[PDB]
Amino acid sequence: SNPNPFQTTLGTDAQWVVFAVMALAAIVFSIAVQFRPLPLRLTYYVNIAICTIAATAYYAMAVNGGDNKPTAGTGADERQVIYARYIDWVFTTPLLLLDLVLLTNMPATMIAWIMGADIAMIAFGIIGAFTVGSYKWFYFVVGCIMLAVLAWGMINPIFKEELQKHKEYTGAYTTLLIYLIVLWVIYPIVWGLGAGGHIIGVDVEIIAMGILDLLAKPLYAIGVLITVEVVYGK
Ligand SMILES: CCCCCCCC/C=C\CCCCCCCC(=O)OC[C@@H](O)CO
Ligand SMILES: CCCCCCCC/C=C\CCCCCCCC(=O)OC[C@@H](O)CO
Ligand SMILES: CCCCCCCC/C=C\CCCCCCCC(=O)OC[C@@H](O)CO
Ligand SMILES: *C/C=C(C)/C=C/C=C(C)/C=C/C1=C(C)CCCC1(C)C
Ligand SMILES: CCCCCCCCCCCCCCCC
Numbered sequence: 001s002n003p004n005p006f007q008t009t010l011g012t013d014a015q016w017v018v019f020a021v022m023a024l025a026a027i028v029f030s031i032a033v034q035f036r037p038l039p040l041r042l043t044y045y046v047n048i049a050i051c052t053i054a055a056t057a058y059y060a061m062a063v064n065g066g067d068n069k070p071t072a073g074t075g076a077d078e079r080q081v082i083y084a085r086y087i088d089w090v091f092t093t094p095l096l097l098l099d100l101v102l103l104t105n106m107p108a109t110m111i112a113w114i115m116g117a118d119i120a121m122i123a124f125g126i127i128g129a130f131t132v133g134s135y136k137w138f139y140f141v142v143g144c145i146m147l148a149v150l151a152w153g154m155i156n157p158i159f160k161e162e163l164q165k166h167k168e169y170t171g172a173y174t175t176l177l178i179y180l181i182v183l184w185v186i187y188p189i190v191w192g193l194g195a196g197g198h199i200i201g202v203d204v205e206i207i208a209m210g211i212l213d214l215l216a217k218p219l220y221a222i223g224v225l226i227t228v229e230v231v232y233g234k
């Protein structure tokens with residue numbers, strides 16, 4: 001019955017921890033890229049941007065979440081809406097896809113609709129998060145279809161040779177992309193259980209997405225960075 005529907009100190013403490021890790025990753029990548037040859041630096045900068053944006057969003061959430069506003073719903077169904085995460089995601093999820101797109105020869109037209117589907121997905125999530133009642137699930141389902149669309153586009157360079165830079169990169173591209181898709185599918189499950197269904201509380205959703213964000217941003221970035229270094233060195 002809409003358990004624990006407001007952020008408490010548990011969720012705030014989790015956000016400060018993720019803030020610290022995101023900030024540290026951004027700093028470490030920023031020092032590291034100074035030592036690396038010019039062809040690799042764009043990939044470092046993309047990941048510095050990702051972790052910096054995420055750190056800023058988690059700073060905002062940790063400073064403000066205890067205000068227990070805004071909310072959606074009334075009476076016993078009222079639940080806090082944490083929306084800073086969506087502002088993070090509309091900038092970082094295109095950059096996370098760009099990490100892999102840079103390993104391919106995708107044409108601009110294809111990059112355009114993959115990135116468009118990604119941005120639409122986030123837009124549907126935040127609209128749904130503020131929607132009271134059953135229409136929230138229309139936004140949710142269309143956002144899920146957008147995830148399927150962007151995933152299909154990202155999968156195509158695996159088996160379309162004309163979309164590949166080198167057959168060499170296919171193993172790492174495939175493995176990194178499967179890791180990404182696995183993690184990204186968990187986000188709508190958390191949303192459906194929390195923001196949508198009010199089945200899990202706000203601190204639980206914060207912790208779940210804090211774990212996902214650490215896996216999907218700095219740990220993923222280390223995998224991408226290792227990949228481009230190994231490929232360039234051979
Ligand atoms: C050009 C660089 C990329 C674009 C600029 C940075 C992108 C976004 C960065 C961080 C995420 C946005 C931070 C979110 C800022 C909103 C503050 C908030 O969450 O309010 C809490 C409530 O209590 C108030 O209603
Ligand atoms: C509502 C605000 C939305 C803000 C979205 C910000 C996203 C910006 C980041 C990325 C956008 C996509 C830019 C894509 C840049 C071109 C990709 C590229 O260079 O790869 C081409 C390959 O075929 C060869 O390597
Ligand atoms: C490819 C690897 C995939 C990794 C999957 C990562 C899964 C992360 C998502 C969920 C993990 C569960 C952790 C979330 C555990 C929440 C429990 C909690 O914080 O209790 C606080 C009280 O409010 C409870 O009432
Ligand atoms: C660093 C942050 C990441 C990788 C966040 C990824 C978020 C998603 C894949 C969100 C997906 C959603 C849907 C598929 C449907 C609508 C609700 C969302 C926004 C949670
Ligand atoms: C190929 C894209 C697949 C799209 C799958 C969408 C699944 C969404 C789950 C539906 C959850 C709605 C629950 C409604 C609660 C009343």
Ligand SMILES: CCCCCCCCCCCCCC
Binds near residue numbers: 211215
């Ligand atoms: C409450 C404890 C939650 C722990 C969840 C941690 C998930 C770890 C998944 C790691 C898989 C990715 C390889 C590093």
Ligand SMILES: CCCCCCCCCCCC
Binds near residue numbers: 031034035
């Ligand atoms: C205040 C910063 C001191 C320098 C830390 C980064 C070192 C960059 C040197 C790389 C040149 C090859």
Ligand SMILES: CCCCCCCCCCCC
Binds near residue numbers: 188189193197
């Ligand atoms: C392709 C993405 C599928 C996401 C499905 C999530 C369904 C779990 C939500 C639970 C709502 C009660």
Ligand SMILES: CCCCCCCCCC
Binds near residue numbers: 050
């Ligand atoms: C090249 C690294 C860019 C890092 C900054 C990205 C934007 C930060 C927004 C707070």
Ligand SMILES: CCCCCCCCCC
Binds near residue numbers: 021211215218
């Ligand atoms: C780069 C740091 C990656 C951290 C992964 C954390 C997994 C969740 C542990 C609670």
